[PDB]
Amino acid sequence: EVETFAFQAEIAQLMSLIINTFYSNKEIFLRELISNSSDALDKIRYESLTDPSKLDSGKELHINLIPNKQDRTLTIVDTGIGMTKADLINNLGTIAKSGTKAFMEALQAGADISMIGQFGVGFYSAYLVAEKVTVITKHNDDEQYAWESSAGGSFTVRTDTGEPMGRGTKVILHLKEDQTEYLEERRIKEIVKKHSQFIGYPITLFVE
Amino acid sequence: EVETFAFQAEIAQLMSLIINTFYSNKEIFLRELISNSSDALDKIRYESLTDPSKLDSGKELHINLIPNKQDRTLTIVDTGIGMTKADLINNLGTIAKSGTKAFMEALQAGADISMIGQFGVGFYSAYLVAEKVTVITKHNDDEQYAWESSAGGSFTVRTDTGEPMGRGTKVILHLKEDQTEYLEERRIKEIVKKHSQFIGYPITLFVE
Ligand SMILES: CCNC(=O)c1noc(-c2cc(Cl)c(O)cc2O)c1-c1ccc(CN2CCOCC2)cc1
Ligand SMILES: CCNC(=O)c1noc(-c2cc(Cl)c(O)cc2O)c1-c1ccc(CN2CCOCC2)cc1
């Protein structure tokens, strides 16, 4: 099953900076992730325009936000384009090694961590709140994989045999002990209404 | 040489709204276009990571801004991924038909035209200043094309036999009579310093 890779050295600094820096405006991790879903959904819609059967694996394009106080996870599910195992290994389809240089350069010269998405490494903002992020994803041209890391230098990539999903990506956020506010329905509706009000796909906040 | 297509009916409304609406903060067309370059450069860098020879058609990734008071054009040149003729026909690789619905919905309910990029139809902001936009583009898997429209319902797509470019996209903006401020070096440096200060590729403002 499991393979264990090392984060590129600059990404590992990024994550460390994100875990360590005192910084109180954490709610943005959501914007970043929903806004990744949105991009993922854009692409499958772009692709469907010319091949309408690429949409065979789900004809409806949406984001669901699924809280679970018990398991202590927030899960964002979308039915976008998905990634290949190769994409997941290559920094979740980002240009991370260079976005971290840009971002890094930006931080000591003014910028604050909210600006992270502007460098296309918005994903790692996940680590403002999650002590463990598992990314489950299915692309049309591949098996369903699972990506996982609790940070500290290395991530993992098993092919997944959990619940098939047809197409999209699913980010389970195993939340930090003191970060459980982002499982409260009040708080999530707030953050989405504040920061993701212009996302052109429906966003369904599940209720427990 | 030339083929003549019709804008999808909703895009044609978009452009008409952009030409007609009284709206004084026009300088944003630049942000939109440079920020399209940036995305185009991201992709060829993403692609080079796994195939480093895709970069054979230019190993350096950048944006040049080239003013010409004489011809009355502003030209933005980048060496990003480029588009296929199929991409250019399909709304310059956007999901325009739906981004215009989202945008449209947003406008009557608060939003102003600066928010256009958030709907992935930021290109048309070009028509806040250009009376004619010509897009010249070369992808690795195709000939160099030219896209053109002065709006009014229809655009054009010739294969291009002007100056080869290796790889990227080039948007010549044939500027409106009273919109020549965006050929002044003062003004362009301003708009870029204000709105495109965090673009992770060099931006070279040519001098006349
Ligand atoms: C290669 C083709 N597939 C995709 O790009 C894809 N499929 O699924 C996702 C994705 C990624 C993440 Cl982190 C999510 O939280 C959700 C999601 O759908 C993605 C994304 C991966 C990465 C990114 C981040 N960017 C890619 C380039 O940098 C600008 C933003 C957005 C979406
Ligand atoms: C299909 C693969 N190729 C490309 O995507 C590409 N190559 O070159 C460009 C491009 C487009 C425009 Cl309008 C420019 O001004 C510059 C440029 O490089 C592009 C772009 C086309 C369209 C867009 C607009 N978006 C695409 C999806 O919506 C979010 C932003 C950005 C870049």
UniProtKB/Swiss-Prot annotation, chains A, B:
Q: Name one GO biological process term.
A: response to cold
User: Altering residue 78 to A: what's the impact?
Assistant: Impaired ATP-binding. Strong interaction with HIF1A, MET, KEAP1 and RHOBTB2. Loss of interaction with HSF1 and ERBB2. Los of interaction with TSC1
List the keywords (alphabetical).
Answer: Acetylation, ATP-binding, Cell membrane, Chaperone, Cytoplasm, Host-virus interaction, Hydrolase, Membrane, Mitochondrion, Nucleotide-binding, Nucleus, Phosphoprotein, S-nitrosylation, Stress response, Ubl conjugation
Using the UniProt record, give the first listed, main subcellular location: nucleus
Superkingdom of this protein's organism = Eukaryota
The positions annotated for binding ATP are: 36, 78, 97, 123
| Disulfide-linked positions | none
Q: How is it modified after translation?
A: ISGylated. S-nitrosylated; negatively regulates the ATPase activity and the activation of eNOS by HSP90AA1.
Task: Tell me the residues on which N6-acetyllysine occurs.
Answer: 43, 69
**Compartments where located:** Nucleus; Cytoplasm; Melanosome; Cell membrane
Q: What's in the GO CC field? A: apical plasma membrane; axonal growth cone; basolateral plasma membrane; brush border membrane; cell surface; cytoplasm; cytosol; dendritic growth cone
Ranges where the record places region Interaction with NR3C1: 1-208
**Entry GO MF terms:** ATP binding; ATP hydrolysis activity; ATP-dependent protein folding chaperone; CTP binding; dATP binding; disordered domain specific binding; DNA polymerase binding; enzyme-substrate adaptor activity
**Reported function:** Molecular chaperone that promotes the maturation, structural maintenance and proper regulation of specific target proteins involved for instance in cell cycle control and signal transduction. Undergoes a functional cycle that is linked to its ATPase activity which is essential for its chaperone activity. This cycle probably induces conformational changes in the client proteins, thereby causing their activation. Interacts dynamically with various co-chaperones that modulate its substrate recognition, ATPase cycle and chaperone function.
The family annotation for this protein states:
Belongs to the heat shock protein 90 family.
Record text on subunit structure and interactions: Homodimer. Identified in NR3C1/GCR steroid receptor-chaperone complexes formed at least by NR3C1, HSP90AA1 and a variety of proteins containing TPR repeats such as FKBP4, FKBP5, PPID, PPP5C or STIP1. Forms a complex containing HSP90AA1, TSC1 and TSC2; TSC1 is required to recruit TCS2 to the complex. The closed form interacts (via the middle domain and TPR repeat-binding motif) with co-chaperone TSC1 (via C-terminus). Interacts with TOM34. Interacts with TERT; the interaction, together with PTGES3, is required for correct assembly and stabilization of the TERT holoenzyme complex.
- Entry's free-text remark on domains: The TPR repeat-binding motif mediates interaction with TPR repeat-containing proteins like the co-chaperone STUB1.
Give the protein's recorded name.
Heat shock protein HSP 90-alpha
Annotated source species: Homo sapiens (Human)
Please state the gene responsible for encoding this protein.
HSP90AA1
List the range of the whole protein covered here.
Answer: 16 to 223 of 732
